[PDB]
Amino acid sequence: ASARERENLQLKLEQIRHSLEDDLDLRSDPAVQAHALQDQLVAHSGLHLSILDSRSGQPLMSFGDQAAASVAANRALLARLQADARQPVFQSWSTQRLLSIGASMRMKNGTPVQVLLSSER
Amino acid sequence: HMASARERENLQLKLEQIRHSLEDDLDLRSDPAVQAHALQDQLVAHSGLHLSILDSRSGQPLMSFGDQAAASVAANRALLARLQADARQPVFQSWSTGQRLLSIGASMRMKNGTPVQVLLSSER
Ligand SMILES: [Zn+2]
Ligand SMILES: [Zn+2]
């Protein structure tokens, strides 16, 4: 493994260490503590997920790496989705190089949502 | 400046995994908070990263989650053995079996006092 790959995994381990040793909530039970560690692993995974309400376009849920998030990219991708573009819709976004993919999904209760998944390239 | 066919295919696979978690989970309840939790768990499951945290005193897993494509039973066993033989930390491990993995391991002490061994693995 290369010098930069090793450097990057060491920086990720340091994020895990900070979560375990400094931020750990002593009041939480182990399953909550485990999910909080999960949150920190996904927070620097290069992946971001936005769930929008199909009716209003308003954000319902947002998870993952802020580094893979962009308000402008997500607005543009939602516009293509609402403009009947063939799904799933792809979008390359460079200002930072993101690849994103969007599609409508239907929750179990029928609630239509727009699902926008972004990735750092 | 545009994403390749392989980049597109890989991201489409992840989106379809997310769709499986929303539309094909027979036991997922309708409660909107419960839906957020399922999606967040599934995002980690294909993040290309896997994290194993073991109690140093017993060897028993305390936490395990992430992507199984990033995990190797054999590699983790070899890395854990290097940690327990007081190799210099953090310990790096490359591993191949078709796929090529990069893992890093270190001993830590959780805030509540538990001594743990941390095995972080990544798809190269
Ligand atoms: Zn912190
Ligand atoms: Zn969960």
Residue numbers in the entry:
A (entry chain A): 38 to 132, 136 to 161
B (entry chain B): 36 to 133, 136 to 161
Sentences from the paper on this structure:
Under direct stimulation by Zn(II), the histidine kinase (HK) CzcS auto-phosphorylates on its conserved histidine residue.
The structure of CzcS SD is a mixed α/β-fold in nature, which can be divided into two domains. In the structure of CzcS-Zn, the N-terminal helix-loop-helix domain is tilted away from the central five anti-parallel β-sheet, which may be caused by the Zn(II) binding at the H1 and H1’ α-helices. Two Zn(II) ions are captured in the structure of CzcS-Zn. In the symmetry operation, this CzcS molecule can form a homodimer, and the Zn(II) is exclusively buried between the central parallel H1 and H1’ α-helices which constitute the dimer interface. A distorted tetrahedral geometry is adopted by Zn(II) to coordinate with the symmetric ligands (His55/Asp60 and His55’/Asp60) from the H1 and H1’ α-helices, respectively.
